mmCIF file of C-alpha atoms and ligand atoms in Angstrom:
data_model
loop_
_atom_site.group_PDB
_atom_site.id
_atom_site.type_symbol
_atom_site.label_atom_id
_atom_site.label_comp_id
_atom_site.label_asym_id
_atom_site.label_seq_id
_atom_site.Cartn_x
_atom_site.Cartn_y
_atom_site.Cartn_z
ATOM 1 C CA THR A 1 -12.788 -3.937 25.134
ATOM 2 C CA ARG A 2 -9.554 -1.927 25.247
ATOM 3 C CA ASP A 3 -7.601 -4.467 23.201
ATOM 4 C CA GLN A 4 -7.116 -3.162 19.680
ATOM 5 C CA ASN A 5 -4.335 -5.458 18.444
ATOM 6 C CA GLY A 6 -4.897 -6.328 14.825
ATOM 7 C CA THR A 7 -4.523 -5.650 11.145
ATOM 8 C CA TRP A 8 -7.407 -3.475 10.145
ATOM 9 C CA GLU A 9 -8.639 -2.765 6.641
ATOM 10 C CA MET A 10 -10.547 0.354 5.804
ATOM 11 C CA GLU A 11 -14.172 -0.467 5.097
ATOM 12 C CA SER A 12 -15.389 3.085 4.553
ATOM 13 C CA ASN A 13 -13.995 6.605 4.753
ATOM 14 C CA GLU A 14 -16.023 9.788 5.268
ATOM 15 C CA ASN A 15 -14.887 13.413 4.905
ATOM 16 C CA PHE A 16 -11.241 12.339 4.666
ATOM 17 C CA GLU A 17 -11.046 15.222 2.226
ATOM 18 C CA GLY A 18 -12.218 17.756 4.811
ATOM 19 C CA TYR A 19 -9.738 16.499 7.373
ATOM 20 C CA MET A 20 -6.730 16.898 5.094
ATOM 21 C CA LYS A 21 -7.899 20.339 3.921
ATOM 22 C CA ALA A 22 -7.933 21.341 7.584
ATOM 23 C CA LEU A 23 -4.362 20.044 7.868
ATOM 24 C CA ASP A 24 -3.381 22.271 4.897
ATOM 25 C CA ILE A 25 -2.478 19.235 2.792
ATOM 26 C CA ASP A 26 -2.040 20.045 -0.922
ATOM 27 C CA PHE A 27 -4.482 19.222 -3.748
ATOM 28 C CA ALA A 28 -2.146 16.713 -5.432
ATOM 29 C CA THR A 29 -1.600 14.747 -2.262
ATOM 30 C CA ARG A 30 -5.344 14.797 -1.580
ATOM 31 C CA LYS A 31 -6.607 13.511 -4.950
ATOM 32 C CA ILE A 32 -4.314 10.517 -4.557
ATOM 33 C CA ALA A 33 -5.142 9.918 -0.905
ATOM 34 C CA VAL A 34 -8.869 9.729 -1.623
ATOM 35 C CA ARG A 35 -8.310 6.955 -4.102
ATOM 36 C CA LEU A 36 -6.593 4.631 -1.593
ATOM 37 C CA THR A 37 -7.483 1.986 0.984
ATOM 38 C CA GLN A 38 -5.873 2.388 4.371
ATOM 39 C CA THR A 39 -4.543 -0.464 6.450
ATOM 40 C CA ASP A 40 -3.930 0.122 10.146
ATOM 41 C CA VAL A 41 -1.652 -2.287 11.953
ATOM 42 C CA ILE A 42 -1.740 -1.996 15.746
ATOM 43 C CA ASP A 43 0.619 -3.806 18.077
ATOM 44 C CA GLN A 44 -0.411 -3.191 21.700
ATOM 45 C CA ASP A 45 1.021 -4.395 25.033
ATOM 46 C CA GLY A 46 -1.164 -2.910 27.729
ATOM 47 C CA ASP A 47 -0.426 0.796 27.587
ATOM 48 C CA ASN A 48 2.286 0.288 24.938
ATOM 49 C CA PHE A 49 1.158 1.075 21.362
ATOM 50 C CA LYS A 50 2.814 0.661 17.982
ATOM 51 C CA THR A 51 0.716 1.880 15.037
ATOM 52 C CA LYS A 52 1.334 1.769 11.277
ATOM 53 C CA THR A 53 -1.123 3.145 8.669
ATOM 54 C CA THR A 54 -0.408 2.220 5.063
ATOM 55 C CA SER A 55 -2.283 3.515 2.030
ATOM 56 C CA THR A 56 -2.613 1.072 -0.888
ATOM 57 C CA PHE A 57 -3.716 1.575 -4.485
ATOM 58 C CA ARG A 58 -3.881 -1.843 -6.145
ATOM 59 C CA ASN A 59 -2.882 -5.445 -5.552
ATOM 60 C CA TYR A 60 -1.594 -7.819 -8.163
ATOM 61 C CA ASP A 61 -1.427 -11.434 -6.919
ATOM 62 C CA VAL A 62 -0.415 -14.379 -9.080
ATOM 63 C CA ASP A 63 0.040 -17.982 -7.979
ATOM 64 C CA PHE A 64 1.655 -20.406 -10.363
ATOM 65 C CA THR A 65 3.753 -23.478 -10.956
ATOM 66 C CA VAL A 66 6.624 -23.145 -13.407
ATOM 67 C CA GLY A 67 5.806 -25.097 -16.573
ATOM 68 C CA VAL A 68 2.068 -25.363 -15.897
ATOM 69 C CA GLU A 69 0.250 -22.984 -18.131
ATOM 70 C CA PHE A 70 -2.652 -21.169 -16.514
ATOM 71 C CA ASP A 71 -5.605 -18.873 -17.256
ATOM 72 C CA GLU A 72 -5.094 -15.391 -15.829
ATOM 73 C CA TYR A 73 -7.628 -12.549 -15.460
ATOM 74 C CA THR A 74 -5.786 -9.280 -15.029
ATOM 75 C CA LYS A 75 -8.393 -7.671 -12.824
ATOM 76 C CA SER A 76 -6.840 -4.588 -11.155
ATOM 77 C CA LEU A 77 -4.811 -4.078 -14.330
ATOM 78 C CA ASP A 78 -6.325 -4.054 -17.803
ATOM 79 C CA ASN A 79 -8.891 -6.680 -16.826
ATOM 80 C CA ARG A 80 -8.088 -8.993 -19.743
ATOM 81 C CA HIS A 81 -7.893 -12.752 -20.008
ATOM 82 C CA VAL A 82 -4.554 -14.226 -20.924
ATOM 83 C CA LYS A 83 -3.028 -17.610 -21.066
ATOM 84 C CA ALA A 84 0.125 -17.594 -18.986
ATOM 85 C CA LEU A 85 3.206 -19.827 -18.855
ATOM 86 C CA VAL A 86 6.277 -19.362 -16.705
ATOM 87 C CA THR A 87 9.571 -21.105 -17.405
ATOM 88 C CA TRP A 88 13.217 -20.950 -16.462
ATOM 89 C CA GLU A 89 15.718 -19.592 -18.957
ATOM 90 C CA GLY A 90 18.775 -20.130 -16.802
ATOM 91 C CA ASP A 91 18.681 -17.808 -13.828
ATOM 92 C CA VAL A 92 15.647 -16.049 -15.329
ATOM 93 C CA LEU A 93 11.946 -16.561 -14.573
ATOM 94 C CA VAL A 94 10.245 -15.899 -17.904
ATOM 95 C CA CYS A 95 6.509 -15.466 -18.342
ATOM 96 C CA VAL A 96 4.602 -15.323 -21.593
ATOM 97 C CA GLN A 97 1.005 -14.138 -21.460
ATOM 98 C CA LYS A 98 -0.856 -15.186 -24.579
ATOM 99 C CA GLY A 99 -3.977 -13.311 -25.646
ATOM 100 C CA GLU A 100 -4.819 -10.062 -27.443
ATOM 101 C CA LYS A 101 -1.577 -8.156 -26.776
ATOM 102 C CA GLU A 102 1.580 -8.962 -28.716
ATOM 103 C CA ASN A 103 4.847 -9.505 -26.855
ATOM 104 C CA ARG A 104 3.039 -9.383 -23.489
ATOM 105 C CA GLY A 105 4.866 -10.884 -20.503
ATOM 106 C CA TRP A 106 7.554 -10.483 -17.853
ATOM 107 C CA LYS A 107 11.015 -11.580 -16.691
ATOM 108 C CA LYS A 108 12.052 -11.864 -13.051
ATOM 109 C CA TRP A 109 15.632 -12.652 -11.953
ATOM 110 C CA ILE A 110 18.127 -12.170 -9.086
ATOM 111 C CA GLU A 111 21.552 -10.567 -9.469
ATOM 112 C CA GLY A 112 23.551 -9.959 -6.312
ATOM 113 C CA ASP A 113 21.415 -8.387 -3.613
ATOM 114 C CA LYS A 114 18.810 -7.219 -6.106
ATOM 115 C CA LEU A 115 15.635 -8.409 -7.840
ATOM 116 C CA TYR A 116 15.121 -7.454 -11.490
ATOM 117 C CA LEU A 117 11.758 -7.265 -13.175
ATOM 118 C CA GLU A 118 11.160 -6.537 -16.834
ATOM 119 C CA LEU A 119 7.562 -5.933 -17.845
ATOM 120 C CA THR A 120 6.739 -6.076 -21.536
ATOM 121 C CA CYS A 121 3.777 -5.324 -23.694
ATOM 122 C CA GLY A 122 4.080 -4.685 -27.413
ATOM 123 C CA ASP A 123 7.239 -2.650 -27.876
ATOM 124 C CA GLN A 124 7.068 -1.086 -24.427
ATOM 125 C CA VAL A 125 9.522 -2.415 -21.840
ATOM 126 C CA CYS A 126 9.270 -1.351 -18.196
ATOM 127 C CA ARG A 127 12.246 -2.180 -16.060
ATOM 128 C CA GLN A 128 12.190 -2.245 -12.265
ATOM 129 C CA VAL A 129 14.817 -3.007 -9.662
ATOM 130 C CA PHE A 130 14.151 -4.041 -6.093
ATOM 131 C CA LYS A 131 16.153 -4.306 -2.859
ATOM 132 C CA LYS A 132 15.340 -6.861 -0.153
ATOM 133 C CA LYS A 133 13.528 -5.611 2.935
ATOM 134 C CA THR B 1 20.253 -18.008 -7.707
ATOM 135 C CA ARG B 2 16.764 -19.337 -8.607
ATOM 136 C CA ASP B 3 15.693 -18.727 -5.031
ATOM 137 C CA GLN B 4 13.608 -15.538 -5.199
ATOM 138 C CA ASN B 5 11.950 -15.610 -1.763
ATOM 139 C CA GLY B 6 11.735 -12.348 0.015
ATOM 140 C CA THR B 7 9.983 -9.086 0.464
ATOM 141 C CA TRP B 8 11.335 -6.698 -2.110
ATOM 142 C CA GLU B 9 11.038 -2.909 -2.337
ATOM 143 C CA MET B 10 11.397 -0.958 -5.539
ATOM 144 C CA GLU B 11 14.350 1.392 -5.847
ATOM 145 C CA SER B 12 13.794 2.158 -9.526
ATOM 146 C CA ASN B 13 11.032 2.009 -12.110
ATOM 147 C CA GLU B 14 11.864 2.776 -15.729
ATOM 148 C CA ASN B 15 9.154 3.451 -18.345
ATOM 149 C CA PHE B 16 6.184 2.354 -16.173
ATOM 150 C CA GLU B 17 4.044 4.813 -18.099
ATOM 151 C CA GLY B 18 4.947 3.492 -21.557
ATOM 152 C CA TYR B 19 4.175 -0.020 -20.399
ATOM 153 C CA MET B 20 0.891 1.169 -18.887
ATOM 154 C CA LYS B 21 -0.246 2.919 -22.043
ATOM 155 C CA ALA B 22 0.575 -0.209 -23.977
ATOM 156 C CA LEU B 23 -1.691 -2.279 -21.732
ATOM 157 C CA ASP B 24 -4.455 0.328 -22.309
ATOM 158 C CA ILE B 25 -4.535 1.360 -18.671
ATOM 159 C CA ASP B 26 -6.562 4.550 -18.295
ATOM 160 C CA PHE B 27 -4.907 7.959 -17.963
ATOM 161 C CA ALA B 28 -6.033 8.850 -14.419
ATOM 162 C CA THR B 29 -4.867 5.512 -13.066
ATOM 163 C CA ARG B 30 -1.485 5.871 -14.822
ATOM 164 C CA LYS B 31 -0.938 9.195 -13.094
ATOM 165 C CA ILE B 32 -1.584 7.779 -9.616
ATOM 166 C CA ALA B 33 0.314 4.549 -10.295
ATOM 167 C CA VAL B 34 3.390 6.351 -11.542
ATOM 168 C CA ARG B 35 3.522 8.231 -8.224
ATOM 169 C CA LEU B 36 3.600 5.088 -6.002
ATOM 170 C CA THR B 37 6.310 2.788 -4.764
ATOM 171 C CA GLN B 38 6.029 -0.948 -5.162
ATOM 172 C CA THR B 39 6.607 -3.969 -2.964
ATOM 173 C CA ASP B 40 6.755 -7.516 -4.274
ATOM 174 C CA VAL B 41 6.302 -10.292 -1.761
ATOM 175 C CA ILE B 42 7.582 -13.528 -3.141
ATOM 176 C CA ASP B 43 6.785 -16.878 -1.585
ATOM 177 C CA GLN B 44 8.593 -19.645 -3.439
ATOM 178 C CA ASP B 45 8.745 -23.388 -2.919
ATOM 179 C CA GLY B 46 10.642 -25.321 -5.548
ATOM 180 C CA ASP B 47 8.512 -24.205 -8.514
ATOM 181 C CA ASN B 48 5.495 -23.121 -6.533
ATOM 182 C CA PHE B 49 5.211 -19.337 -6.627
ATOM 183 C CA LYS B 50 2.987 -17.050 -4.616
ATOM 184 C CA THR B 51 3.544 -13.453 -5.695
ATOM 185 C CA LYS B 52 1.923 -10.359 -4.259
ATOM 186 C CA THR B 53 2.567 -6.880 -5.601
ATOM 187 C CA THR B 54 1.294 -3.811 -3.741
ATOM 188 C CA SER B 55 1.237 -0.168 -4.795
ATOM 189 C CA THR B 56 1.834 2.147 -1.874
ATOM 190 C CA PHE B 57 1.610 5.871 -1.231
ATOM 191 C CA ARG B 58 2.605 7.429 2.084
ATOM 192 C CA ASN B 59 2.673 5.653 5.445
ATOM 193 C CA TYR B 60 2.212 6.865 8.967
ATOM 194 C CA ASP B 61 3.759 5.182 11.964
ATOM 195 C CA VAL B 62 3.406 6.409 15.532
ATOM 196 C CA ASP B 63 4.508 4.830 18.834
ATOM 197 C CA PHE B 64 3.259 5.804 22.270
ATOM 198 C CA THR B 65 2.423 4.757 25.788
ATOM 199 C CA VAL B 66 -1.057 5.755 26.957
ATOM 200 C CA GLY B 67 -0.994 8.574 29.499
ATOM 201 C CA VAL B 68 2.498 9.727 28.487
ATOM 202 C CA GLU B 69 2.785 12.947 26.486
ATOM 203 C CA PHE B 70 5.255 13.094 23.617
ATOM 204 C CA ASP B 71 6.337 15.453 20.865
ATOM 205 C CA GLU B 72 4.919 14.114 17.580
ATOM 206 C CA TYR B 73 6.563 15.517 14.452
ATOM 207 C CA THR B 74 4.177 14.684 11.610
ATOM 208 C CA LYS B 75 6.946 13.960 9.076
ATOM 209 C CA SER B 76 5.197 12.952 5.808
ATOM 210 C CA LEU B 77 1.870 14.510 6.730
ATOM 211 C CA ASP B 78 1.690 18.266 7.379
ATOM 212 C CA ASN B 79 5.126 18.364 8.953
ATOM 213 C CA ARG B 80 4.204 19.970 12.263
ATOM 214 C CA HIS B 81 5.205 19.416 15.871
ATOM 215 C CA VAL B 82 2.445 18.653 18.374
ATOM 216 C CA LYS B 83 2.401 17.612 22.007
ATOM 217 C CA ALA B 84 0.379 14.394 21.867
ATOM 218 C CA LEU B 85 -1.312 12.690 24.758
ATOM 219 C CA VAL B 86 -3.227 9.463 24.447
ATOM 220 C CA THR B 87 -5.688 8.545 27.198
ATOM 221 C CA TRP B 88 -8.663 6.272 27.718
ATOM 222 C CA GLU B 89 -12.191 7.547 27.893
ATOM 223 C CA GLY B 90 -13.858 4.223 28.673
ATOM 224 C CA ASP B 91 -13.253 1.907 25.716
ATOM 225 C CA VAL B 92 -12.297 4.835 23.473
ATOM 226 C CA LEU B 93 -8.635 5.643 22.832
ATOM 227 C CA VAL B 94 -8.439 9.414 22.662
ATOM 228 C CA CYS B 95 -5.589 11.510 21.402
ATOM 229 C CA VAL B 96 -5.342 15.222 21.742
ATOM 230 C CA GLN B 97 -2.682 16.873 19.642
ATOM 231 C CA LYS B 98 -1.751 20.205 21.234
ATOM 232 C CA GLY B 99 -0.313 22.423 18.513
ATOM 233 C CA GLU B 100 -1.131 25.153 16.002
ATOM 234 C CA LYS B 101 -4.484 23.737 14.928
ATOM 235 C CA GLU B 102 -7.519 23.674 17.214
ATOM 236 C CA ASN B 103 -9.430 20.447 17.899
ATOM 237 C CA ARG B 104 -6.644 18.371 16.460
ATOM 238 C CA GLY B 105 -6.550 14.735 17.397
ATOM 239 C CA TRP B 106 -8.237 11.413 17.017
ATOM 240 C CA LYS B 107 -10.325 8.609 18.496
ATOM 241 C CA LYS B 108 -9.877 4.826 18.063
ATOM 242 C CA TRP B 109 -12.387 2.246 19.365
ATOM 243 C CA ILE B 110 -13.667 -1.288 18.640
ATOM 244 C CA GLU B 111 -17.406 -2.144 18.366
ATOM 245 C CA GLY B 112 -17.807 -5.823 17.508
ATOM 246 C CA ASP B 113 -16.109 -6.858 14.283
ATOM 247 C CA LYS B 114 -15.121 -3.266 13.531
ATOM 248 C CA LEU B 115 -12.570 -0.624 14.504
ATOM 249 C CA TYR B 116 -13.929 2.937 14.458
ATOM 250 C CA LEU B 117 -11.575 5.879 13.880
ATOM 251 C CA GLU B 118 -12.317 9.656 14.182
ATOM 252 C CA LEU B 119 -9.778 12.176 12.861
ATOM 253 C CA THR B 120 -10.424 15.788 13.748
ATOM 254 C CA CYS B 121 -8.899 19.143 12.981
ATOM 255 C CA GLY B 122 -10.508 22.559 13.271
ATOM 256 C CA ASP B 123 -14.160 22.121 12.436
ATOM 257 C CA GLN B 124 -13.816 18.909 10.410
ATOM 258 C CA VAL B 125 -14.525 15.348 11.406
ATOM 259 C CA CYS B 126 -13.455 12.313 9.406
ATOM 260 C CA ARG B 127 -15.041 8.963 10.231
ATOM 261 C CA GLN B 128 -13.433 5.667 9.239
ATOM 262 C CA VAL B 129 -14.432 2.055 9.822
ATOM 263 C CA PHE B 130 -12.096 -0.938 9.699
ATOM 264 C CA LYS B 131 -12.288 -4.720 9.534
ATOM 265 C CA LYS B 132 -10.349 -7.422 11.353
ATOM 266 C CA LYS B 133 -7.994 -9.535 9.198
HETATM 267 C C1 RET C 201 -3.830 12.453 5.424
HETATM 268 C C2 RET C 201 -3.299 11.258 4.684
HETATM 269 C C3 RET C 201 -2.947 10.165 5.371
HETATM 270 C C4 RET C 201 -3.154 10.312 6.830
HETATM 271 C C5 RET C 201 -3.482 9.319 7.643
HETATM 272 C C6 RET C 201 -3.689 9.565 9.063
HETATM 273 C C7 RET C 201 -3.605 10.955 9.621
HETATM 274 C C8 RET C 201 -3.917 8.500 9.827
HETATM 275 C C9 RET C 201 -4.136 8.547 11.267
HETATM 276 C C10 RET C 201 -4.252 7.317 11.728
HETATM 277 C C11 RET C 201 -4.498 6.831 13.098
HETATM 278 C C12 RET C 201 -4.117 7.838 14.151
HETATM 279 C C13 RET C 201 -5.055 5.592 13.250
HETATM 280 C C14 RET C 201 -5.348 4.988 14.572
HETATM 281 C C15 RET C 201 -2.401 8.891 4.709
HETATM 282 C C16 RET C 201 -3.296 7.671 4.913
HETATM 283 C C17 RET C 201 -1.024 8.574 5.280
HETATM 284 C C18 RET C 201 -2.341 9.027 3.191
HETATM 285 C C19 RET C 201 -2.051 10.437 2.733
HETATM 286 C C20 RET C 201 -3.171 11.342 3.187
HETATM 287 C C1 RET C 202 6.455 -10.845 -11.059
HETATM 288 C C2 RET C 202 5.797 -9.576 -10.817
HETATM 289 C C3 RET C 202 4.946 -9.064 -11.709
HETATM 290 C C4 RET C 202 4.640 -9.813 -12.972
HETATM 291 C C5 RET C 202 4.324 -7.753 -11.442
HETATM 292 C C6 RET C 202 3.418 -7.168 -12.205
HETATM 293 C C7 RET C 202 3.010 -5.848 -11.757
HETATM 294 C C8 RET C 202 2.442 -5.016 -12.628
HETATM 295 C C9 RET C 202 2.218 -5.444 -14.048
HETATM 296 C C10 RET C 202 2.059 -3.665 -12.205
HETATM 297 C C11 RET C 202 0.779 -3.401 -12.051
HETATM 298 C C12 RET C 202 0.251 -2.085 -11.661
HETATM 299 C C13 RET C 202 -0.138 -1.270 -12.644
HETATM 300 C C14 RET C 202 0.001 -1.710 -14.066
HETATM 301 C C15 RET C 202 -0.721 0.090 -12.369
HETATM 302 C C16 RET C 202 -1.469 -0.009 -11.052
HETATM 303 C C17 RET C 202 -0.494 -0.380 -9.947
HETATM 304 C C18 RET C 202 0.137 -1.746 -10.190
HETATM 305 C C19 RET C 202 1.524 -1.725 -9.551
HETATM 306 C C20 RET C 202 -0.730 -2.847 -9.591
#
């Protein structure tokens, strides 16, 4: 077949390092690049091609129901088992992850056009802000 | 609002490293992770939440019609101009990238469940294999 439409996930990657070295791509960009999965999305109408290649590091999925506490394995992250509960404090999605780490959790809330995410573990607070795409 | 649906992209990320040390995430991983941008896909139904967070390095999009030559500026990659032509050699999509480097181009083709991709430059060949999703 000539029909390549799809979302394609890298299964294996050989001498990627050689190919970038030939492109004169720098060492810092290369040591990252070799630690990533590529995803190629191809949208194709006969001779018309649209191609997007993304390079991922890790994926953190969580499915939950507010108020229903759940067992979470943080594979991808620190690979620990916690005991998670998400509730509403007003506008704010609050999650408490019980386990070995003190003060471990997160807050997620909307203000205006933006999403706010506070990540907390111990006395470290990471704050992130997102725009809609 | 409590409605958090959307596909969100990070515009800032404060103290991701402090948070990551706190979790006991390893050094090498922290150094990659800190150099990525994040996307949170949020699927929300009442109190049902499906959350997916990706970490993402560089992307590469390219649009073309087969048989029509175009100037491809590899913004992001090596930042060079090439005259790129994509043709069919049987079931194999073949791109030659006329520019500074010799033997610069690639080959896409499907064989069964898999997409096969060859990237070449100079005297280097990179093989990749992908999976339908
Ligand atoms: C070098 C390099 C990259 C290059 C990817 C290329 C060159 C993909 C070509 C894809 C095609 C043509 C698929 C069909 C990435 C993944 C962006 C990550 C950074 C390192
Ligand atoms: C509601 C969204 C939440 C709770 C997002 C959590 C995301 C993280 C805790 C970030 C995880 C990552 C690291 C700690 C380093 C590796 C890359 C990430 C982004 C998966």
